[PDB]
């Protein structure tokens, strides 16, 4: 329809892993920001370089909607100027980021009794990510001097790990669905 498809991003049945975060390009549509941004207190909502109460008045070239899942203690990393394994190796925002970050506890959707090992994050990388860079490579990381030749072993680790989201975990280990809206689509 005429409205911007923010429904297909926030309400998607499955979210992407943070190391392979999805991006949705949103252009040439009308958005009801104030209505869809009027979130309840159980939402983590932080905006940068722009006020939420002014988005219904501005127009932008494009609005990128990035979505992924991390654990609760890593939500603070989804912000400009942050460091850590998620901000450096998985999803890096620029220092002059203009947009909003939305997060909510999704323990009832992404955690499994036997463990939801489906969500992954990158643990090792030779250098940090550039802003908005996506690295889905899983080549055997060489932490030493001997070449790995794609073979696992000593000083040669698989660069990815799993979250294994279980409902019995504490909030710091519970899954959180994250949507990052980048502004550079008129609000109405």
């Amino acid at each position: 329809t005429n409205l911007c498809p923010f429904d297909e991003v926030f309400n998607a049945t499955r979210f992407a892993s943070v190391y392979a975060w999805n991006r949705k390009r949103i252009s040439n549509c009308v958005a009801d920001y104030s209505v869809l941004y009027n979130l309840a207190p159980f939402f983590t909502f932080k905006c940068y370089g722009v006020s939420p109460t002014k988005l219904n008045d501005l127009c932008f070239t494009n609005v990128y909607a990035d979505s992924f899942v991390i654990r609760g203690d890593e939500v603070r990393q989804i912000a400009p100027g942050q460091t850590g394994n998620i901000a450096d190796y998985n999803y890096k925002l620029p220092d002059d980021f203009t947009g909003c970050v939305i997060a909510w506890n999704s323990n009832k959707l992404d955690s499994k009794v036997s463990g939801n090992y489906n969500y992954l994050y990158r643990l090792f990388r030779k250098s940090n990510l550039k802003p908005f860079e996506r690295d889905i490579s899983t080549e055997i990381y060489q932490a030493g001097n001997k070449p790995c030749n794609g073979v696992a072993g000593f000083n040669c680790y698989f660069p990815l790990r799993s979250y294994s989201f279980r409902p019995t975990y504490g909030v710091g280990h519970q899954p959180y669905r994250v949507v990052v809206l980048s502004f550079e689509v008129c609000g109405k």
Partner: antibody
Amino acid sequence: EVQLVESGGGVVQPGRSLRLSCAASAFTFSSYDMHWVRQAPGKGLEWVAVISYDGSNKYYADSVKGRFTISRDNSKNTLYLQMNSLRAEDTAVYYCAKDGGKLWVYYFDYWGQGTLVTVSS
Amino acid sequence: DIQMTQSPSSLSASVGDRVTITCRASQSISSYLNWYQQKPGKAPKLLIYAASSLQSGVPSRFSGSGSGTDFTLTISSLQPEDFATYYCQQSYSTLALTFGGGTKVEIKR
């Protein structure tokens, strides 16, 4: 020229509730975002909450989220702050501040003289 | 939250002196830095917004500069009514607005 006058402050027991008000004058109140900022005795300034010009969007600092509630009546040019479940750490002078509106971000260009809120048993 | 660190915490000066305050941000806040003046028993007053823009009605002896993480407020010639505490406040993180600890400009004797 902008005029902001707070009222409703006083003493309150822990866990109770208190409501503040802020009557505005000499500017188009219905086209500017309004803020609440508190300041503990002898401490610095801490932003509390903001409400959109029309009163449809509200956002709070984490220290008061799910605890305070902000509202406005554009027919009376009055701002409100409903403070429920008041802790001792909430004891401060509460200012209402007008947003300058000249930037993409928030900033306080005029402050009221504030009202004291003492939370003790 | 973004931490704003002011230095010095306090400085002594006399009428006619040039005063320079520093405000540092824990991360790049672009140019959304605001300076406020507060006297004892009074509400704050906006001096500079957006790092360098002088608020209407403020004397031109006040000025600000800097971008990114290092910012500066300068009083070209200190007047008797400028002895106060000065706060910087970042507005880059719009839903997590934070102030600096403040800087007290006292009378030197």
